[PDB]
Each structure stands twice: as C-alpha cells, then as structure tokens.
C-alpha cells in the first residue's frame, strides 16, 4: 500500500532532507515524506539519487570488464557492481542490453569579596575616581 | 575611382522565434491603417493601440 512510483517532489525533498540531516538517520527522513518508509528512502538514496552514482553511457573498458566479470562470477551483481563502479541494477540493465543488442546583598550592597590591591613602592593614597 | 569622381560630381558645394506565440497573441498578421500613410500593422492589439497615438 505504501509502495509506489517515485515522484520528483518526493525525490527533491529527499535530496534536501539527506543534505540537512545526514546519511545515517533514515527514520527522520521518512518522517517528512508521505507514502514512503525508511528502508525505501535509504535504498532509494544508495540505488539512484546518490550523486556518487555514475549515470552515463558505458565506455568500451567498462563493457569489457563487465562482460569478463559476469562470466567469472555468474549472477552475482552486488559483488561485480562495486568492481566496475556502477549500480547493480544499472549494470544489470546494461548486461541484458548487451545480450539484447548482440542478437542577595552579597552583590548590590557590599562588595562580594574584597581584595584591596597590595601596595607597592608608590603612593595610592591620593588617587580617587569620578562618578558616572 | 569612378565612385569617387561620381561623388565629387553629385555633392553639395558647401557641406553642413515565438512562432505559435505571435499567432496566439494575434501578431505578425498583415493589416493596414488607411488614414496613417496607408501604414501597415502586424498585429490587432497593436492597431487597437494606434487609436491612441501621437501620429
């Protein structure tokens, strides 16, 4: 019931919330949005919205590396995805794309505690000061 | 050079994008006011503004 499609409003508000609160507090960020939970917010951050994620075409090297690795460790996408530097869902889609296109008074009264200054080789007798 | 001779000859002896926007708004459509120099106006709002003008 809570599940559904992601909205530009929810997604931008997710950007701002993640910016303000920080990465480790999910319940606080899920509190602001409606119809979405904390798990969904976190996985939605790390899966897609995260700026460190690389959204662009795959170069030739990334295709060589992806194909080789996928033939090395079949069906393991969460192991391969960090090695090529792409999202697991993304490299999946691209792979099926490659096979697809490959064929109180202490203050104010009396001076709290008083230290009269000590007296030294000079005359302080005379000195007094003006009012305000 | 010929240009120069000519000028000397005929000179005083003593010198002193929104394409559908303009259709929607009704502009860049050919129109004419007769009383003013048989003038051309490209918009109906503009010609309606001609009614109050200096010229």
């Amino acid at each position: 019931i809570k599940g559904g499609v992601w909205r530009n409003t929810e997604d931008e508000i997710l950007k701002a919330a993640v910016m303000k609160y920080g990465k480790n507090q999910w319940s606080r960020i899920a509190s602001l949005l409606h119809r979405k939970s904390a798990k969904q917010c976190k996985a939605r951050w790390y899966e897609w919205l995260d700026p460190s994620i690389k959204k662009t075409e795959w170069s030739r090297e990334e295709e060589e590396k992806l194909l080789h690795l996928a033939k090395l460790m079949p069906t393991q996408w969460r192991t391969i995805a960090p090695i090529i530097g792409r999202t697991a869902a993304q490299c999946l889609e691209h792979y099926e794309f490659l096979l697809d296109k490959a064929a109180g008074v202490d203050y104010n009264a009396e001076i709290p505690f008083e230290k009269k200054p000590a007296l030294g080789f000079y005359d302080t007798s005379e000195e007094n000061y003006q009012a305000l | 050079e010929e240009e120069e001779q000519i000028s000397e000859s005929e000179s005083e002896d003593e010198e002193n994008i929104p394409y559908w926007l303009y259709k929607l708004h009704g502009l860049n459509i050919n129109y004419n006011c007769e009383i003013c120099g048989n003038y051309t106006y490209r918009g109906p709002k503009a010609f309606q503004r001609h009614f109050a003008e200096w010229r």
Binding site: - | A52, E53, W54, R55
Partner: protein, 78 residues
Amino acid sequence: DATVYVGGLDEKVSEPLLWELFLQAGPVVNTHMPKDRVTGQHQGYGFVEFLSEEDADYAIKIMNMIKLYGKPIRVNKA
C-alpha cells in the same frame, strides 16, 4: 524625443512618484527607474518612453521644472 533622461534624485523617490510626477505634465507610457540590487538603492536617473514624440518635445520645453527632494531634476531628449 519619446524618452527622456532624468538626473539628480533621492532614493525615497521611486518609479511611482515618477509615474505620478511626469504624468502631471503628460502620461509616462513606459517608466524606467533602475533598482540597483547590490546595495539595494537608487542612483537617481530615469528614462521615459511616451505615446509619441510631441508629448516628449513639449516635455523638453516644460519638463525640467521638477524638483525632487528640494533638489534639481535633469530632463533631456533621448
């Protein structure tokens, strides 16, 4: 002549007392009195587009009698 340049003003003046001020003579159709963004205040010089040119030449004749904040107001053709 449809437009005039107006110098020597005080920022408490705005586009409104110019509106009101020069339409006392004849209506200002297009008003321009810059708002400076950086320090949010006016240098006090103006540009005025009228209905046609006759308005503005009479405006050259009459126009420089205005005195904004006890002080002199420049109006010339443009």
